Ligand binder design. Sequence first.
Ligand SMILES: NC(=O)c1ccc[n+]([C@@H]2O[C@H](COP(=O)([O-])OP(=O)(O)OC[C@@H]3O[C@@H](n4cnc5c(N)ncnc54)[C@H](OP(=O)(O)O)[C@@H]3O)[C@@H](O)[C@H]2O)c1
Length: 253
Amino acid sequence: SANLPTVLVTGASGRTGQIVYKKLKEGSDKFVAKGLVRSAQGKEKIGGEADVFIGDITDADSINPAFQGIDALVILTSAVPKMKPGFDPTKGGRPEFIFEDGQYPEQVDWIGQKNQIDAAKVAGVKHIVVVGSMGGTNPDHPLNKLGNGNILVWKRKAEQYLADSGTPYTIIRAGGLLDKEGGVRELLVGKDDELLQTDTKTVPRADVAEVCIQALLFEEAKNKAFDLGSKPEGTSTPTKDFKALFSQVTSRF
Ligand SMILES: NC(=O)c1ccc[n+]([C@@H]2O[C@H](COP(=O)([O-])OP(=O)(O)OC[C@@H]3O[C@@H](n4cnc5c(N)ncnc54)[C@H](OP(=O)(O)O)[C@@H]3O)[C@@H](O)[C@H]2O)c1
């Protein structure tokens, strides 16, 4: 093993996941990419290459092939609520969202993520990175009511399980995600939702993807949990010193 590390990214066809997948592919001088997606549809979307595997994270055996021989894992899966089809705006209410049965946050973000962490551990991974959301410090956060799923709570339960496991881990709680241009913004790291009290609380999906990558290259990023926000494009200078950035973080959770 003077070989480059094999990095598996799950949720590889998701919006943020497809960028990490693409970045790991471009970074051929640093990584060997691998990805896991939920559908053949998703596999073709990111390029149908042979390093992409199809499987459901809540079906334990089903994901084992993907995890074989991996050295690092980047978890980018998430439960996703869909608008329940009954809404009628013109006599004011507010849409209710739903999660397909067996696809709720408890099953996908907590148990599901537990599935992935447990398989990575069996396979001997060395570093696990997971992407989540800011807001977890407040159990009464409105997002937990979406689809009556408590999505932040189950995600944080999997973050604690990851931090507790002993495997080198980085937990990145992202602020509001943006389909905005990555690498063109000064990025900010916070602790325990403090950034929510600022105007720099959202972040380009491409910068969340690049932070996941860099976490893989610095000892500093290991055994760290931090929030991620940024400043708009055009106002300041885009982040470059990543060792410094991660050396700002001291929290293990
Ligand atoms: N949206 C925001 O503003 C925001 C803010 C802060 C944090 N975050 C979080 O940051 C992360 C990235 O966000 P994002 O919007 O870019 O994610 P997302 O794209 O929309 O999706 C993750 C996607 O996760 C996969 N997935 C769901 N259930 C699965 C299962 N049972 N097995 C395997 N894969 C499964 C989905 O598969 P399909 O492609 O088949 O659907 C999909 O690839 C998420 O954890 C999200 O909750 C989001």
